[PDB]
């Protein structure tokens, strides 16, 4: 699988081509994103549950 | 039979002045791979590849 790295500022993203993606929510192993920064601007804004 | 009377110097200078590059390189280019793989070629009848 290919996943974009979450960014901390509003960026300009190039249009990308994707083909694969699952059918359920198999995302439980994700802990947090941009932990060291103040906020996630573009990517998946995951936070500690 | 053919001939070619060369164009005037003035208009040539103007034309050559305005010539943007037709192939510019930038990181955000919307890349798309070929639909059919150009590497291998398959015999459509006996499926022999080359």
From Swiss-Prot, chain A:
Domain of life: Viruses
Compartment list: Virion
Subunit structure: Homodecamer; each decamer is made up of two conformers of VP2, called VP2A and VP2B. 12 homodecamers assemble to form an icosahedral capsid. Interacts with VP6.
Protein family per UniProt: Belongs to the turreted BTV-fold inner capsid family.
Known function: Inner capsid protein that self-assembles to form an icosahedral capsid with a T=2 symmetry, which consists of 120 copies of VP2, with channels at each of its five-fold vertices. This capsid constitutes the innermost concentric layer of the viral mature particle.
UniProt protein name: Inner capsid protein VP3
Whole-protein residues included: 1117 to 1165 of 1214
């Amino acid at each position: 699988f290919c996943i974009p790295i979450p960014q901390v500022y509003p960026c300009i993203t190039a249009r990308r081509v994707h083909y694969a993606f699952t059918s359920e929510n198999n995302n439980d192993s994700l802990f947090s994103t941009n932990a060291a920064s103040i906020d996630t601007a573009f990517g998946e804004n995951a936070a500690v549950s | 039979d053919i001939i070619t009377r060369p164009t005037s110097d003035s208009i040539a200078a103007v034309a050559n002045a305005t010539k943007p590059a037709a192939v510019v390189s930038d990181p955000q280019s919307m890349k798309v791979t070929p639909i059919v793989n150009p590497s291998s070629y398959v015999c459509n009848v006996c499926n022999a590849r080359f």
